[PDB]
Write a protein that holds these residues in place. Sequence first.
Motif, PDB file in Angstrom:
ATOM      1  N   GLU A 270      -1.090  -3.642  -4.614  1.00  0.00           N
ATOM      2  CA  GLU A 270      -1.551  -4.149  -3.328  1.00  0.00           C
ATOM      3  C   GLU A 270      -1.700  -5.672  -3.362  1.00  0.00           C
TER       4      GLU A 270
ATOM      5  N   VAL B 118      -7.156   4.292  -2.321  1.00  0.00           N
ATOM      6  CA  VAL B 118      -7.227   4.084  -3.756  1.00  0.00           C
ATOM      7  C   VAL B 118      -6.494   2.806  -4.117  1.00  0.00           C
ATOM      8  N   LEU B 119      -7.081   1.980  -4.975  1.00  0.00           N
ATOM      9  CA  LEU B 119      -6.425   0.806  -5.540  1.00  0.00           C
ATOM     10  C   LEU B 119      -5.501   1.229  -6.673  1.00  0.00           C
ATOM     11  N   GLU B 120      -4.191   1.068  -6.485  1.00  0.00           N
ATOM     12  CA  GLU B 120      -3.117   1.581  -7.311  1.00  0.00           C
ATOM     13  C   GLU B 120      -2.511   0.456  -8.149  1.00  0.00           C
TER      14      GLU B 120
ATOM     15  N   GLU C 234       0.833  -1.197   0.000  1.00  0.00           N
ATOM     16  CA  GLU C 234       0.000   0.000   0.000  1.00  0.00           C
ATOM     17  C   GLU C 234       0.869   1.248   0.000  1.00  0.00           C
TER      18      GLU C 234
ATOM     19  N   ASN D  67      -1.355   4.671  -1.010  1.00  0.00           N
ATOM     20  CA  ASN D  67      -2.637   5.313  -0.817  1.00  0.00           C
ATOM     21  C   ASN D  67      -3.658   4.280  -0.361  1.00  0.00           C
ATOM     22  N   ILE D  68      -3.998   4.314   0.952  1.00  0.00           N
ATOM     23  CA  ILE D  68      -4.885   3.283   1.468  1.00  0.00           C
ATOM     24  C   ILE D  68      -6.331   3.475   1.013  1.00  0.00           C
TER      25      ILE D  68
HETATM   26 CA   LIG Z   1      -3.859   1.555  -2.434  1.00  0.00          CA
END
Ligand SMILES: [Ca+2]
Length: 223
Positions: free
Chosen positions: A62, A57-59, A52, A54-55
Amino acid sequence: IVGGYTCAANSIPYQVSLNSGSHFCGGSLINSQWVVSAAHCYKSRIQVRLGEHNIDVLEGNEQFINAAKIITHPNFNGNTLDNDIMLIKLSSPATLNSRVATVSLPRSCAAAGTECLISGWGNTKSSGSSYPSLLQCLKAPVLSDSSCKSSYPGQITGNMICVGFLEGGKDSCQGDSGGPVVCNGQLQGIVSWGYGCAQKNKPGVYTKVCNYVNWIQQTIAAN
Ligand SMILES: [Ca+2]
Ligand SMILES: NC(=[NH2+])NCCCO
Ligand code: NA
């Protein structure tokens, strides 16, 4: 983290977020199947979020893996916070890559004055609350056992270290609990307790990981 800066994305690849509907604590990946965190973080169900930054937003990098076992230290004391340490076994091994990596356990305890890196998604404000999307970082030294014990008379055991700044303004906070203090490539601390955060003469107190390498190895071999 109060008084820190935003870590470079994925630059702390051993940092995990423990999630139970939202982020609640940090942890550190120490083997492909095991995370170490703080016992005062305990919940009976936990999802571990690795890779992670940005916890919110799925980047794409992850890995979300549920905990299969959650083991608190048998001598954890909720009053004094002695032995504030917990191991989490993942339901499947984390897949190790540039963004998801283990951190070494300590080869010895750390000298006073050793520089460390503390990280997490905890509160960033010393007045009010602000929970960041982006992983925060703080450079801080291991304090003297003297400076630590003077700050919290009668409350620092042999299983605790202070790391931070006696002036105030730079500390871990609520939501950073269970997360890493890494010094010279070794996990020396776990975010544990303090009197509020970032207050003058109330440095952060951390579980002294160099006392627990046997307990960690024994628990890993037995589960
Ligand atoms: Ca994320
Ligand atoms: N002063 C402190 N760092 N306190 C502990 C922060 C985690 O709740
Ligand atoms: Na004091």
